[PDB]
Design a protein around this ligand. Sequence first.
Ligand SMILES: O=C1N[C@@H](Cc2c[nH]c3ccccc23)C(=O)N2CCC[C@@H]12
Ligand SMILES: O=C1N[C@@H](Cc2c[nH]c3ccccc23)C(=O)N2CCC[C@@H]12
Ligand SMILES: O=C1N[C@@H](Cc2c[nH]c3ccccc23)C(=O)N2CCC[C@@H]12
Ligand SMILES: O=C1N[C@@H](Cc2c[nH]c3ccccc23)C(=O)N2CCC[C@@H]12
Ligand SMILES: CC(C)=CCSP(=O)(O)OP(=O)(O)O
Ligand SMILES: CC(C)=CCSP(=O)(O)OP(=O)(O)O
Ligand SMILES: CC(C)=CCSP(=O)(O)OP(=O)(O)O
Ligand SMILES: CC(C)=CCSP(=O)(O)OP(=O)(O)O
Lengths: 387, 387, 387, 387
Amino acid sequence: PSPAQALASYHHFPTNDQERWWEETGSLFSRFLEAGQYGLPQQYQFMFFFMHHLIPALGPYPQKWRSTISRSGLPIEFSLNFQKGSHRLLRIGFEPVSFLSGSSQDPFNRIPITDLLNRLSKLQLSNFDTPFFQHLLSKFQLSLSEVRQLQPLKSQAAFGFDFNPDGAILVKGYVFPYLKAKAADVPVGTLIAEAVRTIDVERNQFTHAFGLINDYMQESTGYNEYTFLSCDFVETSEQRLKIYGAHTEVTWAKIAEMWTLGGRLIEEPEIIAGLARLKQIWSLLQIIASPIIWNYEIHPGSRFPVPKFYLPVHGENDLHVARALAQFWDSLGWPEHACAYPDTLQQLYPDQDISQTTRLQSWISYSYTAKRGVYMSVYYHSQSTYL
Amino acid sequence: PSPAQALASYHHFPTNDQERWWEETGSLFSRFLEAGQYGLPQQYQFMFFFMHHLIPALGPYPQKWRSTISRSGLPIEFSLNFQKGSHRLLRIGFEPVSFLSGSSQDPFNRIPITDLLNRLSKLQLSNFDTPFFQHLLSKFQLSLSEVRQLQPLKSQAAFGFDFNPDGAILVKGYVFPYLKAKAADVPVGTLIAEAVRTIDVERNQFTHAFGLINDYMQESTGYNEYTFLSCDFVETSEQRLKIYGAHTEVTWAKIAEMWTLGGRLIEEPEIIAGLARLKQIWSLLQIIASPIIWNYEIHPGSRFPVPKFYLPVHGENDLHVARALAQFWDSLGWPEHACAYPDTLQQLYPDQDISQTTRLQSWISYSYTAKRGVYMSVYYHSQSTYL
Amino acid sequence: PSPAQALASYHHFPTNDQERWWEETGSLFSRFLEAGQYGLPQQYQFMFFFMHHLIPALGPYPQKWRSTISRSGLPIEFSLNFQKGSHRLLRIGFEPVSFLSGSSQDPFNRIPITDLLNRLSKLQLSNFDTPFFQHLLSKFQLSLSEVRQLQPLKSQAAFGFDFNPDGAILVKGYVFPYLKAKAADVPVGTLIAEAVRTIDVERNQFTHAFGLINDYMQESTGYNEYTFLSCDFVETSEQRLKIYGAHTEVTWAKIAEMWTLGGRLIEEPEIIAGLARLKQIWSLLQIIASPIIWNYEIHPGSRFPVPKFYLPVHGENDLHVARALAQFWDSLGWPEHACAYPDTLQQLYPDQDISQTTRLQSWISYSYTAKRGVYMSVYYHSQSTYL
Amino acid sequence: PSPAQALASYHHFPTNDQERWWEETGSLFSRFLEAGQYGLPQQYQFMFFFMHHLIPALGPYPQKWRSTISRSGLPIEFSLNFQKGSHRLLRIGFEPVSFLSGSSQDPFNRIPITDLLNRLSKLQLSNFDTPFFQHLLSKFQLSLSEVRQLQPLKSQAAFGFDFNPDGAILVKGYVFPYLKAKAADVPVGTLIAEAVRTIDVERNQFTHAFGLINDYMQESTGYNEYTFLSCDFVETSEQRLKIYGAHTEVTWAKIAEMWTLGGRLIEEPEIIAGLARLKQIWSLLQIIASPIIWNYEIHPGSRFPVPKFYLPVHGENDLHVARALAQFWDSLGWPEHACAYPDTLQQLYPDQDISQTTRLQSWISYSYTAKRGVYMSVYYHSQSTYL
Ligand SMILES: O=C1N[C@@H](Cc2c[nH]c3ccccc23)C(=O)N2CCC[C@@H]12
Ligand SMILES: O=C1N[C@@H](Cc2c[nH]c3ccccc23)C(=O)N2CCC[C@@H]12
Ligand SMILES: O=C1N[C@@H](Cc2c[nH]c3ccccc23)C(=O)N2CCC[C@@H]12
Ligand SMILES: O=C1N[C@@H](Cc2c[nH]c3ccccc23)C(=O)N2CCC[C@@H]12
Ligand SMILES: CC(C)=CCSP(=O)(O)OP(=O)(O)O
Ligand SMILES: CC(C)=CCSP(=O)(O)OP(=O)(O)O
Ligand SMILES: CC(C)=CCSP(=O)(O)OP(=O)(O)O
Ligand SMILES: CC(C)=CCSP(=O)(O)OP(=O)(O)O
């Protein structure tokens, strides 16, 4: 059996809500810790964190709230990031929920966000600052706008957790400006740009790269309801703000157009390299429906954005995807990651049979760097009951 | 005996810290409820509120933290506002505290502020929006600044509670920009002005009145470490932002100079009348030391600010102050407040003998309106142990 | 509207479960406080107690547990005790519950009992000792017996609350020995007797009166599964232990037989008088089904038990019951109690129409004393949703 | 560094009291887990338990209450039990405390006892029944006796925790009858005997062995204020009730007199063997002051009690004690325990230097069985600040 869930033996979950969430996701998270090749102390250490801070935050077990972050809508999903031979890392995307979420007292779920954010500040966490994130929230609050609004997707922020191989967690926060933009009847990008600009006199290090993205977005009508924003919980210097968006139907040409941001960054050799490898997968993988997602990461020092795409897998035979996914690793030359992948997939879902499963894996992310190589992460069915 | 503290009979305070605060301020608060002439249901209604939300927030009973708001430093003080015959209202100024306050984990006591701010949002309160207050906080966070700072008065925010005669509480928030200003080596007003301006594109209704004050402050070197800011927790339309300040030594001419903001607002007839009554008290009252405080209230629609002063009484025989205080009510012609005041003062401090007491009563506020008449509020010794 | 529920305005019920109970029983409890003619401070004072200690203890709102105490099974019911002209008193029967109640971890609901019993010991309550009640609990625990039993009515204990006109609560505790007896395959009385005897060397003041009851119980086959036990939470001197039981079918002669405990206490003149009045009601009231209940109260100093009967009213037109119930008050000569009763009945149930109602009032209790006169209490539909 | 305290990194202790207890005993417990040779999963597993249930129960950090269990009075002490080559086990003796302990509301510290006992019952613990222990508590409660008493050692109960090598805890409970006996002005043994007898009709399996002990105790005037009682939290069949006591001054002959319980059990060969070894230690060890303690364990099935003694070591050079203690292990022929002990002792107290320390180890327990061999346990300085 899988190990880290040994802690619960001498723990009593206060509410029935929590007990049911534990039963729904407890084992599953323990398995990803195992599949993440984490040190046994670290496994229990993050297991500890999961129980105390995330299980309370899931809210009522029979969940009444759909979270924007998941295809299915439940407030959590688990991620594995694969690297060049180093190993794999585990990722959690979170949207705090309570019984008030979606109700008269909090129809758009701001309350749990601020609650959870104080738990985290209470925990003695390395390099944990909130100002930048506070800034974006303030930029997107509502008030009397709620009243307008009350007369789709309702969540207004989200969280992310990266458990690095060291026993350290890194906290990632999201912001969904669709609500704020819709209430003011102002195009999303106009306030996104103005939101980015408002931090520019605060420090003008994102102007170049962003204005470079905002131009391509306005060219291509890339901005839409689905566009949203991201950031890290740390000192501004080391912070990486990210802009996400989606497109309903996308061809390879459109993908190349976006990956090169029009033609903005054909000059950089990295992108050209990154785009080549990308079509190798595009061919493996796909060889009313879910959209494809894109990402532009604005490291502050640099002059260009770094792209990243998210590719729908739910709807594709999770075995075909495991197979093709493994073929692509040999092409890159990852010895252990490609050989033991599909065995690692069944060991996460022993109840299910990959031969016939489709929803078990939902997204794949692609990034490329000269230094790192090929970033790539897989997003999974993150509960233990499958329809 | 006084009534409203009957609730405590069948209530158990969880920590020893809370129990000791109840013993220190519980009866006293019950008495102010009485002296405010509140409906008995409302007394228990606000008494309920006091126990659940404010007693937890006071922190360690032997308090480790000095709050900026009080002369003595304790995180609470009670106010009575007297009106033209209508009656009196009760006011509480609050700074949440915990055992972490002043420690490495939160050396400047930001954590309790955001905690309490979520309790209030969870309570179903009429007309309660946080965006404006959130905006100012974001404008004054610190992060790496803490580390510089760690190498006076430390608080960054505070709360205010107005209990109107109806069973409704109104929430007032404060902000102390001295910290943010000291870390960035930027004069307070420049970021105050820039802080106000940042809300001007957000809505430019404070520009005229504020720029009108900021000119006088820069004329007179009025800005100082002690300058801070205020506002209300409601819709921007009905919100009244306030700038406070202090002066070490001040003459009547200095008072007149300030009340008329230099000469900015001699045009308004209101000011001249209000100043007239004001000297009427100045003469009664005063007829290394504590400073005198001023306030400029920027109602958004209007074109001028409304002044308000705060007058030191701690150090003056609290009976002499009661006597002089009541004479001034007849001059105004308030039949009942002036006749039954000093009896109302002793009934708040039956343990003490006003003949010899000095610290029981600490500040007096003065505002004047054509419509309202004479605003005036008294700030008291708000614990039950007197040195 | 009814008053005491004004407290909830500035209170947030932590769980969804509690919120739903408040909505279900909150208004109703406020009305019984009103209908009890309690001083307005005391109303809020007991209303305070109800919110903090009883609402948490009700457990899941869609209740998973049937309580033995109620005909319907819900863990609470309200009582009014009518006296000779003095006034009326409010009574609550309680069984604490949690989501664990009825589960593997606590299949017979012992856990909630002990939790609530500590809350109460924490409250500073006058004349509150637990030794006597603990004694009965110890005598009726299970352990390995639970396992046997897992292979009807399941509860092992319950609470009762008397709110006297003074701001003081008196706590009444119950015990249901059917389980312990069924596990040990021992007739209930033999261990009940041995339970009473175990306190006899502890103090032999109940021997005479009890042995007097145990004989009649063995004569008439009175003991049965439904027999259970009661007591008060105070000093042994002032404690009144009671034995209850039931009979499926009962005639007047059986009633007379039981009231005079066979012939055990025909000698006492009180009994004869009390029995006379009793038939006066039996005639008014009744002029697969619910049983009739009896009670024998063993005051320690005295030598005889005092009886008490409980009469099914659910199934009787609650108006017919009100009319006849009030006629009987004139017979005794209670001026105000008899005139304003049925108006007091509708004012408790304005949503319902007494002309058509049957379940609104369920039991009537009868005791007689030379000193007190006629004890008599009414048991009501104690939730706000009626089927 | 020592490992198990890694859990604290991502946990925030709610109160300052808890934080200070963590800082005072947290590392030390982590080290005993290490010194017990527990599986790393089990270490964290018990570490989890220690943090959630025992740190809360210690009460105010600057402790206001003296616990009967410890020489110094602090409510906790850690034990190591050494066996024949199998390994060692870790033991914790606990007395729950709160800020109410010793106050008017609970002058003899009963409330924390019942609270902790409910946490434990909520935990799904193997073979956890409370009936036997509840029986003893009820036999020793007070009520009006409290008031008498208010007009030494005050605690009435305590807990013990055995962490077996498997990830399972066994709960041991204590009871201190001196208070109940002092109240009723009745000698301790009479009610202890009557207490044991009351469980005899409940099951008469302890009669023979106990009546066998009660005779020697009233022969030798062995009963005294210090006499108290113990038991296990499980099914009566597997329960081992124990009687403890003390003697001010004791010679070897007295020890032989006590070990052989007068002459009651010279017939048994075990005792004679056990006593031989015992003098072997007495000579090694000792070769206004603390008393020496004895224990008689009444396994229900058997016909004789098994003794156990406790020998004062605090006051003896803890290195001399380690040396002599280790020599005795070779005499028995325990290879690894004897070679690496004093290295194991310094590794528990690296801050201290055994050359000069005296209080680091406080008691040694000795038991003998034919089957087990030589039971023997050491009781240590169980906080991290040494005077
Ligand atoms: O279908 C969707 N999936 C998520 C992806 C996601 C998974 N996890 C996340 C965590 C944070 C942000 C986004 C995500 C998302 O971003 N959507 C935008 C509108 C529709 C919806
Ligand atoms: O002496 C002082 N009193 C408070 C007044 C106060 C009472 N209550 C308050 C509530 C909110 C803000 C201010 C106050 C104040 O504003 N000071 C500024 C620097 C020195 C310090
Ligand atoms: O139908 C019933 N009613 C309750 C009466 C009750 C109301 N409230 C109470 C409170 C405590 C004890 C008993 C009661 C009772 O005693 N029963 C015994 C078996 C059937 C079941
Ligand atoms: O000095 C003493 N030590 C404890 C020993 C102990 C350690 N841990 C324990 C745990 C449970 C019971 C007893 C103990 C004890 O039993 N005493 C009886 C009277 C004096 C006091
Ligand atoms: C599925 C969508 C829209 C986003 C996934 S979030 P992420 O895992 O890519 O975040 P990082 O790559 O770690 O920045
Ligand atoms: C004593 C000082 C500097 C400020 C008092 S805050 P306040 O009572 O004046 O608040 P309002 O007048 O009610 O706006
Ligand atoms: C309906 C049944 C069986 C019992 C009611 S318990 P009680 O209210 O009679 O308790 P007291 O009469 O107040 O002693
Ligand atoms: C120091 C004293 C009086 C008692 C110690 S309790 P203990 O360690 O002997 O408990 P067990 O031996 O495990 O029964």
